[PDB]
């Protein structure tokens, strides 16, 4: 038993990173994340 | 010359005799026979040999080291009893 | 249990000699003599374990050594022995049985 | 140059030809050790030539510690005589040297990393694991341990000339990678 | 609340990854044969069930050697209260045969 | 909303189900148990390939194709039972579970405390 | 083995001890396997990187790191003990560089943190101190 092997960080890390990249919460949800519009400060 | 030795010896004689008494009484021999054994043994008791137990023995090149325990030695007609002993000897 | 090596000691030989006499000289039950020696083996062991304080130091030339059947035999020549006094011995024979 | 390697250890094998009772052997030999629980052989020793023998029940024997081939055969015959004297029908046969170790000093420091890079296929160097460079020579097939200090160890030889051959072959390389 | 570690952040990461530091805690770290065999057989008439442990305690020999000979005299029962214990199937003649061999 | 999630939700989620026990049987039965304590969040950081680790300010974060995140640590206490008998190793661990993206201007990111000219040094238009 | 290889081939560096912390390989057995694998790769035909990584563990300033780099190159050229594995030299080189500067790690903290025997760091320090003359970048 060694803690580093027991806990796998990319589970959480790459999980969230993935989700926000694709914006699919599951599909059970999609398009939740969207790249910001910098067209104009109003936009 | 050692005093602890004579004390140990005394403990041995006294301890053995009392324990042996049961068997002596069982064999229906004689209390005074037991007493004789005691007196003769102590009488006899009045060649550079050490009898003991070893904990560890090591060697490096021709150098030996030994950790001895619970023993008795007769060196130059004198008796010593010890708890521990360290031996540092050089072989050729 | 209990090794019979201590019978070769001064106190051990004396016991042997005493018993041998009671057997031969008298008519004292042999076999019982063995029972006694079995007691001796145990007593010397516990006594040397619980009733000793001395620490010895032996330094000299190793003339001979040997090992077989859990027994180490050493023969030290021209050695100085330190009790807790300094003694010198031309030839010392050591016989040691496994503590475990 | 001028340096010639010094032999440091010779390992040999000998067939006694008969089965042995190890307790008997250990008991009768003047300088023997035998603990069945640790290793299955009597470890016997003689003072001249100073060597150590590993004696097996099959009657096979390994003799090590000698500094010369002469000393190896001499000490081997001696161990065989001891077995005979103890009473077995032993015979001194099949004496064969299996390994010769040699060493020397080139007297200058060596750049191990450069050598390892240059002679990569024969070299192995991991200073954190072991400080010396392990050089596996093709002809002769000898293994050399090379140290920063300039001390050299040569091993794996069956004949003395191979130790000498390897050093002669390695010297130019050690020179090429000197520090001063 | 939740506390934000303010350090140089290098130390924390060093502990996170391979740190060159290990252990420091432990969790889930995880008589001759003639008389010997004769004596053991007298035990078998004395005990219909016994163990290699009881036999090794008596014979002071490795259980592996005890298991070999017992396979000849005794058989093993692995089921029931006596499970993992050998049961039997003249004794003086066997002892004299052991003395001869 | 994000700030409330960071302060309260992480602590509550970890606390709600942390305790897990292993049941060990022997023939004496045994337990092993691991609990999760106060969680710890860092400031935003970056792990470079070589392994050098350093703080991350968002500008560079954009330029280098990075993810702006802080690490998370958890206090793991491990216990062993033998059956409620309690032996175990505790305190001494602070464990890295993974990285959490961090919304800019939130309490966690470095910019939320910045001032005007401060921001200008970091080149994030106020 | 294959991991440590890919580290090497990737110009990244990881210590035998580090990987040894991810996996229990028993050590010496590992060296033999690694060497045979290395031989196979050739058949199929550098401490410096460690220095910044260590600073990270201590969170040291950049100047400290580059100072340490100059120190490592200078120490290797001056020879004298050849390094006794790179790890001791990298850590001692640091210990010098930091002690040049006012920033305390003291000693036991770096010996613990970086897993180098305190006696080792001080021993390296005496010899390194002797050559303080030529190691000075400015």
């Amino acid at each position: 038993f060694n803690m580093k092997l027991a806990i796998n960080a990319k589970t959480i890390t790459s999980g969230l990173k993935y989700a926000l990249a694709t914006g699919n919460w599951g599909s059970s949800r999609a398009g939740v994340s969207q790249v910001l519009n910098r067209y104009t400060y109003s936009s | 010359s050692n005093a602890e030795a004579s004390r140990v010896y005394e403990i041995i004689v006294e301890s053995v005799v009392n324990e042996v008494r049961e068997d002596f009484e069982n064999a229906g021999i004689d209390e005074q026979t037991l007493q004789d054994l005691k007196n003769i043994w102590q009488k006899k008791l009045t060649e550079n040999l050490m009898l003991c137990l070893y904990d560890k023995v090591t060697r490096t090149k021709a150098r030996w080291k030994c950790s001895l325990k619970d023993g008795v030695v007769t060196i130059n007609r004198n008796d010593y009893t010890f708890q521990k002993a360290q031996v540092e000897a050089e072989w050729v | 249990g209990y090794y019979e090596l201590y019978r070769r000691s001064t106190i051990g030989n004396s016991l042997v000699d005493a018993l041998d006499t009671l057997i031969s000289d008298g008519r004292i039950e042999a076999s019982l003599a063995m029972r006694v020696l079995e007691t001796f083996d145990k007593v010397v062991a516990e006594t040397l374990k619980d009733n000793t304080q001395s620490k010895l130091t032996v330094k000299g030339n190793l003339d001979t050594y040997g090992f077989c059947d859990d027994v180490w035999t050493f023969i030290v020549k021209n050695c100085q022995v330190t009790v807790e006094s300094v003694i010198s011995v031309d030839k010392l024979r050591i016989v040691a049985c496994n503590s475990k | 140059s001028g340096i010639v390697p010094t032999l440091q250890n010779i390992v040999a094998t000998v067939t006694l030809g008969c089965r042995l009772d190890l307790k008997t052997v250990a008991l009768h030999a003047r300088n023997a050790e035998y603990n069945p629980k640790r290793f299955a052989a009597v470890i016997m020793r003689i003072r001249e030539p100073k060597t150590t023998a590993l004696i097996f029940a099959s009657g096979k024997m390994v003799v090590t510690g000698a500094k010369s081939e002469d000393d190896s055969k001499l000490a081997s015959r001696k161990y065989a005589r001891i077995i005979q004297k103890i009473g077995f029908a032993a015979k001194f046969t099949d004496f064969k040297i299996q390994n010769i170790v040699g060493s020397c000093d080139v007297k200058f420091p060596i750049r191990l990393e450069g050598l390892a890079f240059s002679h990569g296929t024969f070299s192995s160097y991991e200073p954190e694991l072991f400080p010396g460079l392990i050089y596996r020579m093709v002809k002769p097939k000898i293994v050399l341990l090379i140290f920063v200090s300039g001390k050299i160890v040569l091993t794996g030889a069956k004949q003395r000339e191979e130790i000498y051959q390897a050093f002669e072959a390695i010297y130019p390389v050690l020179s090429e990678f000197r520090k001063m | 609340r939740i506390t934000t570690l303010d350090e140089t952040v290098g130390v924390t990461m060093s502990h996170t990854g391979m740190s060159m530091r290990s252990d420091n805690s432990n969790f889930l770290k995880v008589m001759p044969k003639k008389e010997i065999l004769d004596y053991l057989f007298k035990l078998f008439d004395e005990y219909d069930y016994w163990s290699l442990k009881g036999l090794k305690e008596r014979t002071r020999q490795p259980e592996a050697h005890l298991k070999e000979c017992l396979d000849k005299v005794a058989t093993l029962v692995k089921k029931g209260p006596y499970a993992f214990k050998y049961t039997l199937r003249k004794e003086e003649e066997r002892k004299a045969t052991l003395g001869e061999l | 909303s994000f700030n409330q999630f960071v302060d309260y939700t992480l602590q509550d989620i970890i606390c709600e189900d942390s305790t897990l026990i292993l049941e060990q049987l022997a023939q004496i039965s045994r337990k092993y148990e691991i609990s999760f304590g106060k969680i710890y969040v860092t400031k935003p950081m970056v792990n470079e390939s070589d392994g050098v680790t350093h703080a991350l300010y968002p500008q560079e974060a954009r330029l280098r194709n990075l993810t702006y995140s802080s690490g998370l640590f958890v206090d793991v206490k491990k216990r062993t039972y033998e059956l409620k008998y309690e032996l175990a190793e505790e305190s001494e661990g602070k464990v890295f579970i993974g990285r959490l993206p961090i919304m800019l201007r939130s309490k966690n990111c470095y910019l939320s405390e910045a001032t005007e000219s401060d921001l200008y040094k970091l080149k994030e238009c106020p | 083995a294959s991991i440590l290889i890919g580290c090497r081939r990737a110009e990244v560096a990881r210590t035998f001890k580090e990987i040894q912390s991810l996996i229990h390989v028993k050590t010496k057995e590992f060296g033999k396997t690694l060497n045979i694998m290395k031989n196979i790769l050739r058949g199929k035909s550098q401490n410096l990187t460690y220095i910044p990584r260590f600073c990270s563990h201590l969170g040291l300033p950049m100047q400290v790191t580059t100072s340490a780099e100059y120190t490592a190159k200078k120490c290797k050229e001056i020879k004298e003990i050849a390094g006794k594995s790179p790890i001791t030299i990298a850590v001692v080189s640091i210990y010098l560089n930091i002690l040049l500067f006012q920033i305390p790690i003291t000693a036991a903290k770096v010996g613990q943190t970086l897993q180098v025997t305190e006696g080792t760091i001080k021993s390296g320090y005496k010899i390194l101190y002797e050559h303080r003359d030529k190691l000075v970048d400015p």
Side-chain angles (χ1 to χ4, degrees), chain A, chain B, chain C, chain D, chain E residues 1-30 32 54 62 64 74 80-81 83 96 99, chain F residues 1-86 88 93-126, chain G:
Chain A
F1 184 85
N2 53 342
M3 284 296 180
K4 301 174 182 176
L5 289 183
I7 297 102
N8 193 28
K10 282 182 177 174
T11 301
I12 292 172
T13 296
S14 70
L16 291 176
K17 176 183 176 179
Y18 168 76
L20 296 180
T22 61
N24 325 20
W25 256 249
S27 301
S28 187
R29 277 186 167 183
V32 176
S33 175
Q34 293 175 335
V35 297
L36 187 66
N37 287 339
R38 292 196 176 284
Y39 298 138
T40 187
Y41 185 77
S42 173
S43 175
Chain B
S1 311
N2 183 23
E4 187 193 295
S6 67
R7 178 74 267 252
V8 172
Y9 282 9
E10 191 202 340
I11 296 183
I12 295 167
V13 172
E14 304 296 340
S15 196
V16 171
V17 170
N18 290 53
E19 290 174 53
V20 174
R21 184 173 286 108
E22 184 181 84
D23 284 291
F24 253 67
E25 297 180 336
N26 287 348
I29 174 69
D30 192 56
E31 169 66 39
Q32 310 314 134
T33 296
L34 177 58
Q35 291 301 318
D36 296 337
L37 180 62
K38 187 174 176 301
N39 298 315
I40 311 168
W41 181 6
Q42 297 187 131
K43 185 175 61 63
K44 301 283 189 175
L45 189 52
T46 301
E47 72 305 299
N48 300 347
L49 176 65
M50 182 186 284
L51 301 166
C52 56
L53 296 169
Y54 63 80
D55 259 349
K56 191 207 298 69
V57 172
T58 64
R59 179 211 123 250
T60 295
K61 277 288 191 176
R63 183 184 177 178
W64 296 72
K65 289 179 189 173
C66 319
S67 301
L68 313 171
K69 301 272 282 188
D70 314 348
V72 57
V73 215
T74 295
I75 299 172
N76 296 318
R77 302 178 57 184
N78 291 130
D79 305 332
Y80 300 86
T81 55
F82 59 87
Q83 230 294 305
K84 314 181 204 303
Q86 186 63 212
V87 187
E88 285 174 24
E90 179 100 339
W91 201 79
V92 186
Chain C
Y2 309 118
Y3 304 115
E4 303 177 17
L5 57 0
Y6 298 120
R7 299 193 201 186
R8 310 169 54 183
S9 70
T10 300
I11 189 177
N13 280 300
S14 300
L15 178 59
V16 164
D17 289 355
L19 289 171
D20 281 346
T21 303
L22 295 193
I23 297 180
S24 304
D25 167 67
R27 63 189 173 284
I28 288 59
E29 265 74 277
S31 306
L32 167 54
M34 187 178 103
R35 223 71 175 260
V36 181
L37 288 174
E38 297 188 323
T39 311
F40 176 78
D41 300 327
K42 179 187 66 179
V43 167
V44 187
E46 302 166 326
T47 302
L48 290 177
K49 177 171 59 70
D50 313 308
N51 299 279
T52 51
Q53 292 87 205
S54 300
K55 195 296 184 63
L56 265 185
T57 296
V58 186
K59 291 191 187 186
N61 297 333
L62 188 57
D63 191 57
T64 282
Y65 65 88
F67 182 85
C68 197
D69 302 290
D70 260 356
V71 183
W72 271 107
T73 293
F74 309 110
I75 292 187
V76 183
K77 296 279 187 62
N78 293 7
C79 52
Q80 301 201 148
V81 181
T82 301
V83 180
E84 281 288 65
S85 193
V86 188
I87 301 89
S88 310
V89 211
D90 289 8
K91 180 183 183 174
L92 173 65
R93 169 179 294 267
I94 306 175
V95 171
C97 290
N98 202 333
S99 48
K100 292 74 66 186
Chain D
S1 206
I3 312 103
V4 191
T6 313
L7 301 192
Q8 303 296 340
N9 181 43
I10 306 238
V11 178
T13 48
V14 179
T15 299
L16 295 179
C18 72
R19 272 251 147 196
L20 310 181
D21 189 274
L22 299 189
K23 295 282 179 182
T24 302
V25 172
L27 178 62
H28 294 283
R30 305 178 192 179
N31 202 334
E33 281 192 65
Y34 179 54
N35 318 279
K37 286 164 174 36
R38 195 203 169 173
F39 194 60
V42 172
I43 300 170
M44 193 183 294
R45 298 187 168 79
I46 61 173
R47 297 170 188 157
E48 231 105 81
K50 193 204 155 135
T51 40
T52 297
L54 301 178
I55 304 171
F56 299 81
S58 60
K60 293 292 185 72
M61 167 174 87
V62 171
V63 184
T64 186
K67 302 249 166 196
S68 79
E69 305 97 321
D70 161 310
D71 278 352
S72 189
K73 182 167 73 82
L74 226 211
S76 295
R77 296 173 180 284
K78 289 180 178 175
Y79 283 112
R81 190 51 185 169
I82 294 171
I83 298 312
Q84 293 176 337
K85 194 188 138 169
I86 293 174
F88 301 94
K91 189 185 178 181
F92 173 69
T93 44
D94 301 333
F95 176 75
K96 174 182 169 180
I97 283 163
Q98 305 285 179
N99 187 38
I100 298 178
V101 186
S103 72
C104 55
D105 194 346
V106 296
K107 301 291 185 60
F108 52 85
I110 306 173
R111 285 141 46 220
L112 302 183
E113 187 44 61
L115 176 22
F117 176 71
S118 172
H119 291 230
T121 40
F122 311 122
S123 299
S124 171
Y125 181 49
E126 294 160 63
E128 293 177 350
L129 180 68
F130 180 68
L133 185 146
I134 298 150
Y135 196 109
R136 300 192 193 255
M137 198 165 275
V138 179
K139 217 290 139 188
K141 191 166 185 291
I142 291 306
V143 177
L144 306 89
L145 311 194
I146 300 160
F147 303 87
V148 173
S149 59
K151 299 284 212 298
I152 308 299
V153 174
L154 307 97
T155 191
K158 284 282 198 259
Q159 260 87 214
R160 170 181 298 225
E161 288 182 296
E162 305 169 336
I163 295 288
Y164 291 170
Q165 251 136 48
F167 185 60
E168 284 177 55
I170 202 73
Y171 197 87
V173 188
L174 302 179
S175 256
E176 185 196 353
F177 293 98
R178 66 157 71 77
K179 295 180 182 297
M180 337 97 57
Chain E
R1 182 59 60 85
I2 285 178
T3 61
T4 61
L5 274 59
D6 284 345
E7 291 78 355
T8 63
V9 176
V11 176
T12 59
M13 274 301 179
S14 65
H15 287 291
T16 62
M18 56 193 81
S19 177
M20 294 182 292
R21 302 185 64 186
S22 177
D23 185 69
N24 298 335
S25 67
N26 300 327
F27 183 77
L28 288 57
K29 295 295 185 178
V30 307
Chain F
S1 176
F2 176 80
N3 290 335
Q4 181 161 355
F5 161 80
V6 164
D7 294 346
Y8 302 132
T9 306
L10 265 52
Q11 185 67 230
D12 290 347
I13 290 174
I14 305 307
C15 288
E16 65 190 342
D17 191 65
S18 66
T19 56
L20 52 79
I21 69 101
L22 179 62
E23 175 188 2
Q24 179 57 59
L25 279 66
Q27 183 172 354
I28 292 170
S29 63
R30 177 180 297 178
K31 285 180 180 177
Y32 303 133
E33 177 179 4
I34 300 168
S35 296
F36 295 88
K38 187 189 299 177
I39 183 169
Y40 296 136
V41 69
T42 58
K43 305 299 283 186
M45 71 188 87
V46 167
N47 175 33
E48 287 190 356
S49 69
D50 52 355
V52 59
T53 297
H54 61 77
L56 171 64
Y57 293 104
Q59 184 63 63
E60 176 178 2
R62 293 182 184 87
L63 289 174
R64 301 182 64 189
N65 285 333
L66 301 179
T67 298
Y68 188 85
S69 62
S70 66
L72 260 58
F73 292 92
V74 177
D75 300 340
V76 174
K77 294 178 177 177
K78 61 193 76 179
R79 290 184 175 90
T80 296
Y81 299 138
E82 295 170 353
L83 53 73
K84 284 182 176 179
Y85 168 79
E86 185 171 4
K94 194 184 297 178
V95 175
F96 177 85
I97 51 178
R99 296 176 183 272
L100 174 62
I102 303 303
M103 182 175 285
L104 278 67
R105 292 288 191 274
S106 58
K107 289 179 177 176
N108 184 258
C109 172
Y110 298 125
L111 297 178
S112 66
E113 295 178 352
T115 59
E116 189 175 3
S117 63
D118 183 2
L119 288 174
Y120 290 101
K121 285 183 68 67
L122 293 171
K123 296 179 177 178
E124 294 299 319
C125 183
Chain G
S2 63
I3 282 173
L4 193 153
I5 304 306
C7 178
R8 303 301 181 87
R9 186 63 58 186
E11 291 181 349
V12 185
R14 305 299 175 194
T15 300
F16 300 159
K17 294 176 179 175
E18 292 179 352
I19 305 164
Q20 184 60 223
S21 69
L22 282 177
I23 300 171
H24 309 290
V25 197
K26 184 66 179 296
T27 307
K28 184 174 184 177
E29 144 275 309
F30 176 76
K32 297 176 178 177
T33 304
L34 187 144
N35 206 28
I36 68 171
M37 176 63 179
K38 187 189 299 177
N39 300 132
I40 293 171
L41 294 179
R42 300 288 182 268
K44 295 301 290 185
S45 64
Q46 53 181 18
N47 190 346
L48 181 57
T49 59
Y50 291 96
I51 312 296
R53 295 177 60 247
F54 290 98
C55 301
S56 304
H57 301 72
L58 301 174
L60 298 177
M62 180 70 178
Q63 60 182 16
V64 175
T65 300
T66 181
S67 174
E69 173 181 5
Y70 185 68
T71 297
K73 181 181 172 60
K74 296 299 285 183
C75 292
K76 179 174 73 179
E77 290 181 351
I78 296 173
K79 187 66 182 297
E80 290 185 352
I81 297 176
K84 310 212 169 191
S85 66
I87 179 61
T88 188
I89 299 299
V91 62
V92 298
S93 300
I94 285 171
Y95 183 69
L96 172 65
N97 288 277
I98 180 174
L99 290 182
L100 178 63
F101 303 99
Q102 58 187 21
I103 52 173
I105 291 174
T106 64
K109 286 184 65 64
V110 64
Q112 293 178 337
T113 302
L114 276 64
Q115 186 56 58
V116 176
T117 302
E118 175 273 339
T120 298
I121 68 173
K122 285 189 177 298
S123 175
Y125 176 72
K126 178 179 179 179
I127 179 170
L128 185 56
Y129 177 83
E130 183 276 334
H131 291 295
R132 179 187 62 194
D133 299 345
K134 295 177 178 179
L135 301 171
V136 176
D137 184 4

